[PDB]
Amino acid sequence: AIDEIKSRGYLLVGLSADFPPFEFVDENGNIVGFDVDLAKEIARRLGVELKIVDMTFDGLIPSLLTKKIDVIISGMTITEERKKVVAFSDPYFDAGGGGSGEQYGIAVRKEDTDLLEFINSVLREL
Ligand SMILES: NC(=[NH2+])NCCC[C@H](N)C(=O)O
């Protein structure tokens, strides 16, 4: 990291802009959606600018591991398989209601505990 992000002055958020209404490319060519608005809010509250890094969906977790992005906010279902490799925020979208079915989370490298705690605070505030 959080201190490193604040020092850099920007948050790099990975997603795959092919999943409306969460992320998509609009009639103007800009990446927009629910997850973009959320990325912006987290950046705003960290005091930093946002850079969205668009990539193919399968590329996200490898990008997060190699530190090309700080977080994934890309309609990503919290799963036990993915918890082997990354940490998730608390869910921010409940596809099925009453916490059933797919719950979307923000993926963070397991080492970045500070950043995950902060993201969880933002989510509760929202
Ligand atoms: N931006 C995207 N293409 N997201 C696809 C998400 C599909 C499903 N929720 C998953 O986590 O695999």
Please state, in angstroms and rounded to a whole number, the distance separating the CA atoms of residues 28 and 5: 29
Does the beta carbon of 103 sit less than 6 angstroms from any atom of ligand 1? Answer: no
CA distances from 33 to 6, 22, 79 (A): 25, 5, 23
Give me the number of domains the chain comprises.
1
DSSP 105: -
Does the beta carbon of 18 sit less than 6 angstroms from any atom of ligand 1? Answer: yes
Q: Which residue has the tokens 């668009």?
A: 54
Does the beta carbon of 54 sit less than 6 angstroms from any atom of ligand 1? Answer: no
Please state, in angstroms and rounded to a whole number, the distance separating the CA atoms of residues 54 and 45: 22
Say what the alpha-carbon torsion angle 25, 35, 71, 91 is, to the nearest 10 degrees. -150
Tokens of 74: 């890309």
Tokens of 78: 């919290």
Ligand 1 binding pocket mutation candidate from 13, 52, 57 (most atoms within 8 A of CB): 57
Please state, in angstroms and rounded to a whole number, the distance separating the CA atoms of residues 83 and 4: 24
Q: How many Å lie between the centroid of ligand 1 and the Cα of residue 18?
A: 9
Alpha helices (H) in 9-104, listed in sequence order: 34-46, 60-65, 80-83
Does the beta carbon of 93 sit less than 6 angstroms from any atom of ligand 1? Answer: no
Q: Contacts for 119-123 with beta carbons within 8 Å, 24 or more apart?
A: 119/42, 119/71, 119/89, 120/89, 120/90, 122/41, 122/42, 122/45, 123/89, 123/90, 123/92
Please state, in angstroms and rounded to a whole number, the distance separating the CA atoms of residues 63 and 76: 14
Please state, in angstroms and rounded to a whole number, the distance separating the CA atoms of residues 15 and 117: 21
Neighbours of 33 (CB within 10 A): 21
Please state, in angstroms and rounded to a whole number, the distance separating the CA atoms of residues 46 and 119: 9
Does the beta carbon of 76 sit less than 6 angstroms from any atom of ligand 1? Answer: yes
Parent domain of 47: 1-126
- Resolution, rounded to a tenth of an Å? 1.8
